[PDB]
Amino acid sequence: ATLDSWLSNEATVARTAILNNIGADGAWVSGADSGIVVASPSTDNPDYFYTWTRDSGLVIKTLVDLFRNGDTDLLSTIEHYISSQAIIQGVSNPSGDLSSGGLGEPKFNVDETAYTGSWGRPQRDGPALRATAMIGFGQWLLDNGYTSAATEIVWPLVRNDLSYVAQYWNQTGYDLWEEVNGSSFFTIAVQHRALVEGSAFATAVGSSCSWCDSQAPQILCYLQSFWTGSYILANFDSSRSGKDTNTLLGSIHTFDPEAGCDDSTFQPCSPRALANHKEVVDSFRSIYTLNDGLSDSEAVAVGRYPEDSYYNGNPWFLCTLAAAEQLYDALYQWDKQGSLEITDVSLDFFKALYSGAATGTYSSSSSTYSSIVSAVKTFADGFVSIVETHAASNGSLSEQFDKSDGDELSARDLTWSYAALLTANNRRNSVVPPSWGETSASSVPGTCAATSASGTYSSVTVTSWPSIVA
């Protein structure tokens, strides 16, 4: 009713707002070079007029998926991004050069110059995210007969990022929130994915990624350590509880539509990800006045972590959208499978929504199933309603919304907020991303080793783009 139509409208707004934030024709970011995704046009309090590898990677992957689904007009935006990355990779910065750690640098100026002040650096998710976004585009180029562009432009760029991940995964750094110096689930999860799809891509182009192959299994091995028995620990080397939407993000950004409810990869429907889901969301129920009065079977406004004090610690549009997207993903998986399972690990999650929940296997034709799935859908939609309630009248999505009154705060028109909107809508409509090979990369080795593999680095120069038609 309100929701479906609001989403339809918001999706259009979200696409437009992202384009306005990408150089060099982006309406909100004059000064940004060609293909530079700006986090936000906000240049003062806060100053987000920079380009983050993470934000850009996430945004572009989203645009790539839209493109592959028929949004052909996004072609030049993607080409520009790729071209810009060829340059950025080579920018000498506080984290190093191309071959000596440069790839890990969190953000840059919109003009493609290094940001030299103090920052929580490096952030090792970046390279993984940029690689995943490029690989998707690379796959389309292969499928549509533009092998050369894939082999000579995309591969070489990806190869740099894959080498970095394989080389430093087992080293500390900052989390996606840029505040904890340690080992972060989100980072580890996206790094394992990148290596697996990086390897398949390498083969597709007639090359190889030996370092992708030796390291992926080891990253996976390590990933298991994040399960505490009741939830996913966001970070090692932290004094916090460990409950963080970092873990929801890790799950949705590594969702493979071909995968079952695999615990080893923390898929959306896995018992571990469902138990984690409740523990995370529940942590925001009594700390935000905006959540006052809601029951345990009701959607709530979700922040980053319960201990957050950034701008006082408020819910985030993207964190709230992620809580819904994980559910949309699990619905798709159960439906595709033709059953859902309730285990001791995930009982609390189900029991909060369907009080008659009991462990066992429920086929898609069973009454229990119908009852659970409707309840899950209503819950998932509830998170999206909170978003709709607090968005600006014209559809503007901010970074945060006030924990007490829901007013928008922090960076305005946050590009990441817009991409999160698109992906949650997509999943809601059963529009899923291409598979990354999870079905051949969920086996955990019997012994985890603290290791690395060094790949190879080489500077890429993009002379010209072939005249691609879509």
Ligand X SMILES: *[C@H]1O[C@H](CO)[C@@H](O)[C@H](O)[C@@H]1O
Ligand Y SMILES: C[C@H]1O[C@H](O[C@H]2[C@H](O)[C@@H](O)[C@@H](O[C@H]3[C@H](O)[C@@H](O)[C@H](O)O[C@@H]3CO)O[C@@H]2CO)[C@H](O)[C@@H](O)[C@@H]1N[C@H]1C=C(CO)[C@@H](O)[C@H](O)[C@H]1O
Ligand Z SMILES: *[C@@H]1O[C@H](CO)[C@@H](O[C@@H]2O[C@H](CO)[C@@H](O[C@@H]3O[C@H](CO)[C@@H](O)[C@H](O[C@H]4O[C@H](CO)[C@@H](O)[C@H](O)[C@@H]4O[C@H]4O[C@H](CO)[C@@H](O)[C@H](O)[C@@H]4O)[C@@H]3O)[C@H](O)[C@H]2NC(C)=O)[C@H](O)[C@H]1NC(C)=O
Ligand U SMILES: *[C@@H]1O[C@H](CO)[C@@H](O[C@@H]2O[C@H](CO)[C@@H](O[C@@H]3O[C@H](CO[C@H]4O[C@H](CO)[C@@H](O)[C@H](O[C@H]5O[C@H](CO)[C@@H](O)[C@H](O)[C@@H]5O)[C@@H]4O)[C@@H](O)[C@H](O[C@H]4O[C@H](CO)[C@@H](O)[C@H](O)[C@@H]4O[C@H]4O[C@H](CO)[C@@H](O)[C@H](O)[C@@H]4O[C@H]4O[C@H](CO)[C@@H](O)[C@H](O)[C@@H]4O)[C@@H]3O)[C@H](O)[C@H]2NC(C)=O)[C@H](O)[C@H]1NC(C)=O
Residues flagged as binding site for substrate: 119
In whole angstroms, the minimum distance from the beta carbon of 134 to ligand Y comes to 19
Asked if residue 460 binds ligand X (CB under 6 A), the reply is yes
The yes-or-no answer on residue 175 being catalytic is: yes
Burial class (CB in 10 A: 0-12, 13-18, 19+), 7: buried
Tokens of 337: 């499978």
Among 15, 49, 156, 186, binds ligand U (CB under 6 A): 49
Question: Binds 134, which of ligand Z, ligand Y, ligand X, none (CB < 5 to 8 A, cut-off by type)?
Answer: none
- Report d(CA 141, CA 83) in Å as an integer: 15
Asked if residue 79 binds ligand Y (CB under 6 A), the reply is no
The residue from 25, 178, 307, 388 that is catalytic is 178
Question: Residue 342 corresponds to which amino acid?
Answer: I
Residue 455: helix, strand or coil by DSSP?
coil
- Report d(CA 39, CA 21) in Å as an integer: 7
Question: Binds 178, which of ligand Z, ligand Y, ligand U, none (CB < 5 to 8 A, cut-off by type)?
Answer: ligand Y
Asked if residue 226 binds ligand Y (CB under 6 A), the reply is no
Question: Binds 287, which of ligand U, ligand X, ligand Y, none (CB < 5 to 8 A, cut-off by type)?
Answer: none
Question: Residue 155 corresponds to which amino acid?
Answer: W
Asked if residue 465 binds ligand Y (CB under 6 A), the reply is no
Asked if residue 114 binds ligand U (CB under 6 A), the reply is no
CA distances from 109 to 39, 48, 51, 157, 158 (A): 11, 10, 6, 20, 22
Among 224, 396, 429, 435, binds ligand U (CB under 6 A): 396
Question: Binds 289, which of ligand Z, ligand Y, ligand U, none (CB < 5 to 8 A, cut-off by type)?
Answer: none
- Report d(CA 129, CA 436) in Å as an integer: 13
Strand-pair category, 107-108 with 51-52? antiparallel
Among 102, 217, 268, 395, binds ligand U (CB under 6 A): 395
Strand-pair category, 408-409 with 339-342? unpaired
Sites for ligand Y among residues 177-196 (CB under 6 A): 177-179
Tokens of 380: 């998932």
Binding piece for ligand Y, criterion CB under 6 A, among 11-19, 50-58, 183-191, 447-455: 50-58
Planar angle of CA 281, 282, 285, nearest 5 degrees: 100
Block residue for tokens 């229990």: 368
DSSP-derived secondary structure for 343-390: -TTTHHHHHHH-TT--SEEEETTSHHHHHHHHHHHHHHHHHHHHHHHH
Question: Binds 443, which of ligand X, ligand Y, ligand Z, none (CB < 5 to 8 A, cut-off by type)?
Answer: ligand X
In whole angstroms, the minimum distance from the beta carbon of 244 to ligand Z comes to 11
The yes-or-no answer on residue 408 being catalytic is: no
Asked if residue 311 binds ligand Y (CB under 6 A), the reply is no
Of 97, 246, 255, 96, give the one whose Cα is nearest residue 182. Answer: 246
Residues near ligand X (CB under 6 A):
86-87, 89-90, 98-99, 156, 167, 217, 262, 438-443, 445-446, 449, 451-452, 454, 456-461, 463
- Applying CB under 6 A, the residues found at the interface with ligand Y are 39, 48, 52, 54-55, 118-120, 176-179, 310, 416
